[PDB]
């Protein structure tokens, strides 16, 4: 969005997939921040990314964004495993690239994975899931991990059905939601194996804040009842998940050994996607206690919190001050990482 | 892809769509080449894009590549057309602000790569952002998807023989008829028969496999009539969105074109449709066949065909100025 575009380097970490490095200068950049946008974003995330790149100019960190297969196939369920593999491939590339370019020590360069919106799912999934060594793509450990506005899509839809979305009131959205579920359930039962029934964009965008296309199977994941015993792949950040369930995700960060550093969560204080019935402070403390195993570890970054007056994506002209604050928290996190 | 990536500028031509500009600050860049393709032929393509970008560095042309809505997804040609028009509008404004407007004599060329060639012809010949006129147009490896599938069914694809492909093709037919509320077919099965290797809706697969012989995609089939070519190549003059000339570049060893297609006759017929049998002079005389070129010119053995292709583009752009 800055006039004249943003200068940088377009890399190929696979033959099909790319990562864009933001850079204007000769300066040394041994360290790397890989930013993972929302599902279906690719390199097209805006929000605070320009301000972050501008702020990282004087530093020893260069900002990366990337494309995944899920950037192009944003409508399918069961996507986080593939996302995670491609992030790992991108991290491997960045690590060799930064060694080759600036030399120094082989593993001097530090890597931080930042998730934005539903990109935060990829961050937690990267850290929490099994890391097998199967040969028929090992994930490297991160020096840091950030999740910006990790919000439940399930609970966001509940809030849309309660309050409305845009011009549309609850009474107008409801008939479409009920029709969409009925369509999605019918497709799950009746569609041929391997096919995906894409639901109408006209209908889904009335109920879905992300405004990305939806298959029947993917939509069902977002609306079917979360089981008190277990939720879906996407449903990592719902406020009514049990401590047992948080132990399977946040609690597995310590066990997998892929974060040799801190996890910082940055909630948005005026996040319009989060229901007013959700206590955000309780939610962060429960994630902290799950992550730290009730004081046994110190993985959770205490500097995690709720950005005052920030919206979900911090998009507005209103959001100049929260954006600047958010960017300053990222630079402070990154500064603490390089000070020993 | 080159060691250390390739430097440039990432632009947002809409809120959600982007175009990457290959450029350096050492030379001014009043002129612009917009390079278009489907998923795999666009912003994230390999092909000959690195060679083209490097070759334009000393010139007054910068190279743009873009994401469409159809790049994400993989009626689509009207949407493609609109998004190319939006990107061209952005490029023109950007380059006007940077290097001056009509007094600087800035030029815009639209280049279609593989699947992007359909978008180039549709942009030019179809009768919502209003489409701007182009100073030039290039179509590289324009191929019939219909005849590419026919060729796969006759000769196989990859490690599959036609015998191995036929049960997959028949199942996809059976899966598609049952579907015909948009239904995507299994990508692991459609990629066995479809050379472009992108997801197909059930209607699109039936459109490509059913012989009307024509859907809106079917622009470059060799068995299309002169009357049907008049509606596409013939409408370039009448729409008035091409100021300069149309250069078409076939790949000599294109594996997706059937061996039986007479490429020389196909160039003669497109030329005659484009120029209306000598009434107009729109067809570029440097159009032709690149010797030994594969569809994408991607392999390590394609250095010579890539050089040939790049020089055709450089000479075309040089002539335009």
Swiss-Prot record, chain B:
The keyword Hydrolase applies. Belongs to the sidJ hydrolase family. It is an enzyme of class 3 (hydrolase). Its EC number is 3.1.-.-. Homodimer. One of its GO terms (molecular function) is hydrolase activity. Keywords: Hydrolase. Displays specific fusarinine C (FsC) esterase activity but does not hydrolyze triacetylfusarinine C (TAFC), which has the same core structure as fusarinine C. Both extra- and intracellular siderophores have been shown to be crucial for the virulence. Subsequent to chelation of iron and uptake, FsC and TAFC are hydrolyzed and the iron is transferred to the metabolism or to the intracellular siderophore ferricrocin (FC) for transport and storage of iron. Pfam families: DUF1749. This is Fusarinine C esterase sidJ. It comes from Aspergillus fumigatus (strain ATCC MYA-4609 / CBS 101355 / FGSC A1100 / Af293) (Neosartorya fumigata). The keyword RNA-binding does not apply. It comes from the Eukaryota. InterPro entries: AB_hydrolase_fold, SidJ. The lineage of its organism: Eukaryota, Fungi, Dikarya, Ascomycota, Pezizomycotina. Disruption phenotype: Leads to decreased growth and increased intracellular accumulation of hydrolysis products of the siderophore fusarinine C. PANTHER family: UPF0613 PROTEIN PB24D3.06C (PTHR31591:SF1). It catalyses: fusarinine C + 3 H2O = 3 fusarinine + Fe(3+).
């Amino acid at each position: 969005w800055p006039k004249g575009g943003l200068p940088g380097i377009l890399h190929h970490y696979t033959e099909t997939l790319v990562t864009f490095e933001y850079t204007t200068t000769t300066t040394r950049k041994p360290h790397s921040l890989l930013f993972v946008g929302g599902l279906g974003d690719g390199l097209a995330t805006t929000s605070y990314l320009a301000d972050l790149a501008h702020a990282l100019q004087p530093t020893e960190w260069s900002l990366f964004t990337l494309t995944l297969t899920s950037s192009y196939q944003s409508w399918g369920l069961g996507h986080l495993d593939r996302d995670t593999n491609e992030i790992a491939q991108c991290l491997k590339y960045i690590k060799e690239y930064k060694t080759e370019k600036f030399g120094g020590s082989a593993s001097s360069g530090k890597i931080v994975l930042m998730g934005h919106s539903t990109g935060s799912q990829c961050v937690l999934h990267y850290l929490s899931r099994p890391n097998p060594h199967t040969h028929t793509v090992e994930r490297m450990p991160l020096d840091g991990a950030i999740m910006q506005a990790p919000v439940s899509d399930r609970e966001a839809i509940q809030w849309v059905l309660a309050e409305g979305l845009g011009d549309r009131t609850p009474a107008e959205i409801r008939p479409v939601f009920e029709k969409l579920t009925s369509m999605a359930r019918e497709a799950a039962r009746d569609a041929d194996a391997g096919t995906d029934v894409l639901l109408p964009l006209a209908m889904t965008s009335l109920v879905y804040p992300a405004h990305t296309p939806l298959s029947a199977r993917r939509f069902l994941s977002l609306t079917s009842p979360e089981s008190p015993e277990s939720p879906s792949e996407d449903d990592l950040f719902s406020s009514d998940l049990s401590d047992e369930q948080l132990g399977k995700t946040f609690g597995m960060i310590r066990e997998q050994g892929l974060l040799r550093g801190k996890l910082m969560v940055l909630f948005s204080g005026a996040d319009q996607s989060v229901p007013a019935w959700v206590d955000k402070d309780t939610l962060l403390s429960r994630w902290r206690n799950a992550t730290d195993h009730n004081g046994e570890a110190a993985i959770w970054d205490e500097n995690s919190g709720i950005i005052p007056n920030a919206s979900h994506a911090l998009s507005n002209d209103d959001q100049a001050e929260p954006r600047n604050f958010l960017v300053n928290k990222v630079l402070g996190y990154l500064s603490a990482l390089v000070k020993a």
